[PDB]
Symmetry: C3
Subunit: 248 residues, 3 copies
């Protein structure tokens, strides 16, 4: 037996607490349950649509995610609203924290005639996708196996960012804290280029080494924030069109 | 042209003889037919739900499988009863004998609104899955190509067994016949730990080096037989939920 | 920014010009448009069902393909007639020119109850498959990302040809122009063995080093042309049965 700390992260109303209660066998606050190989400390985090805030029940999950307290995340995704839910999923995968997708509410998806190829999605994301109906306890055993087996997400180029955006993000990834892993550093630097207020606190040579970067791009990109978000949305649409019935 | 000996193995009533008659062009007992690269000697084996018997038209297929007479198996699986049929399939894949899944009765599956992602299943099993309707001769040519191309199953950890169970299975895999390949030895040792009566005959330091093993686990596992079977069933459920419409 | 020359190739009436107009933003003849990384010169080629003619709006596309003018192809495939469209696709993949499948008319496929697993098809073909509805501009952004990311098709044995056919094709691949890459040479040699009239012009030791080859096979294959075509059709049927609802 090894120890694992796992965070439940997902949009508001995606079924995180329901899944929490199922795993921990809660009576009708950290949880603890056993898998085959792990004693898992489980943290139910407040819902969030995104790890980016430009101005402001959480940016609590983000701060929790970046604290290094979690070894792995369970990203709870509502299957009936896939494309909307996948924005947060992509941010987590760009960050590189080991994760498993708990693709929840599949009974609701089925009622609305939504079809998702589970393993196709997993191969596009580079992490396991475990189908669940959390209210029914369906898929929990498979989720527990995936927590014992998953070690690291696949190293995919997920989002296809214009090279000028990555040049200037990577320069910032060179300034900052250096302790903090490269994947996280480039992520922090794109978050900075989007106008995220919380990410400078995690830098090193921190804040407005950003003003040089954001001016180094006027010959190239008009609104970097909009270009970064758009590249993300494009990626998610391409995934949903391939693995789901969303194209038509 | 090379020679191949192929066994047809599957549950009772899965379409083995029908497929046999199609491949051999039998008139309305070993068969022989040509693929592009092989002269195939085909053996129609008696149906079985499982290669485990704790007390007792076959354990004939099992004895045939373990004799080394077959180079490859065609595992004939009834698509309309996937989860039930996959128990035998998993045993064959744990054994490691080269195999191809002939996913038969897909017309019946379709009538009962069963949807199976063929290549997703193949990637989860680690061997080719060839969709058939054997009564219609549909898929036979693709099956023949797969017999020429398939060499070895992928080396996947299929079933996620508690480590104490594998410790004690592997010790037995150390005793026995040593001629007999490691994959087959660990398989024989888990079969022993489940109470299979036929597997001691295939050991070496044979039988009740099992009593030491089965007592070496009372600090850990209550009923090893039940724990092994459950791990298997869990694996199969996880596969069917991902690649089929069984979750909901 | 790098330069790319891309040919649009596909059967008559598969939506090539529609896709051309969408990419180039044509007003209601080469095009030019930007992707993230490339300035793409786009060539709308005349439709063709096949790159083989034994006797004779094109063999223009074939001559264009073999000229080396295109860096990459977009193979425009009508999803509502997959199996028929895939004959040309296979020829292109056997040739080895970098390509992306634009799986078009998916709205029509959906109306006729056709289901295609997009990523399963991509893995069977060894190149990206981008789902489109070209009249709606749906999927164009994902297509543009794929043109920036795709470098080389996967090196799969697609079609399972009787070894005598490949022996004699490869001997011819030894004669010819030697400048011309091995994959293209074997392709030219199978085209010769099928009776293609245009391929001798691209040989070296050219034409009727074919008469020796075609007589070197009477102990083995009756009609090599029919055997080659059949192997191709078999391959396509096997693909469609796995990734589409065509088996039953
Ligand atoms: N039909 C169905 N409903 C579900 C499933 N999972 C959760 N729910 C329902 O969805 C509701 C919201 O679930 P809950 O566990 O509180 O969500 P949460 O994501 O913890 N939301 P919050 O961010 O407000 O904490 C609950 O009524 C629960 O019963 C599911 O798989 N299917
Ligand atoms: N609709 C349909 N029926 C099939 C198909 N394959 C086999 N059958 C039918 O299923 C029945 C049982 O088939 P058979 O070939 O004897 O099965 P077997 O697996 O050899 N059974 P046994 O273990 O008793 O030897 C036969 O009537 C056959 O016609 C299939 O693809 N679709
Ligand atoms: N419903 C639907 N129709 C489409 C789509 N793509 C093209 N079409 C329609 O199909 C017709 C034929 O398209 P077009 O672009 O000329 O095809 P082409 O493959 O260039 N044919 P040609 O070989 O004759 O050049 C046009 O009326 C177009 O509107 C699609 O995704 N869905
Ligand atoms: Mg909650
Ligand atoms: Mg029979
Ligand atoms: Mg699939
Ligand atoms: Mg046209």
């Amino acid at each position: 037996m090894q120890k694992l700390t796992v965070g439940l992260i997902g949009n508001p109303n995606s079924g995180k607490t329901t899944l929490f209660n199922q795993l921990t066998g809660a009576r009708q606050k950290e949880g603890i349950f056993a898998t085959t190989d792990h004693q898992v400390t489980l943290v139910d985090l407040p819902g969030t649509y995104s790890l980016t805030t430009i101005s402001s029940d959480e940016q609590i999950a983000c701060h929790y995610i970046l604290s290094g307290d979690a070894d792995m995340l369970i990203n709870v995704v509502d299957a009936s609203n896939l494309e909307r839910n996948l924005y947060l999923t992509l941010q987590l995968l760009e960050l590189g924290i080991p994760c498993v997708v708990a693709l929840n509410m599949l009974d609701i998806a089925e009622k609305q005639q939504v079809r998702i190829d589970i393993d196709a999605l997993a191969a596009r994301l580079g992490c396991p996708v475990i189908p669940l109906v959390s209210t029914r306890g369906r898929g929990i055993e498979a989720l527990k196996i995936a927590l014992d087996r998953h070690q690291a997400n696949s190293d995919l180029e997920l989002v296809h960012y214009p090279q000028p955006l990555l040049r200037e993000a990577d320069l910032l990834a060179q300034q900052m804290s250096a302790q903090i892993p490269p994947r996280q550093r480039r992520w922090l630097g794109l978050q900075m280029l989007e106008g995220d207020i919380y990410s400078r606190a995690y830098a090193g040579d921190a804040a407005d080494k950003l003003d040089i970067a954001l001016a180094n791009l006027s010959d190239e990109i008009d609104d970097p924030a909009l270009h970064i978000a758009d590249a993300r949305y494009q990626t998610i649409a391409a995934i949903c069109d391939a693995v789901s019935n969303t194209l038509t």
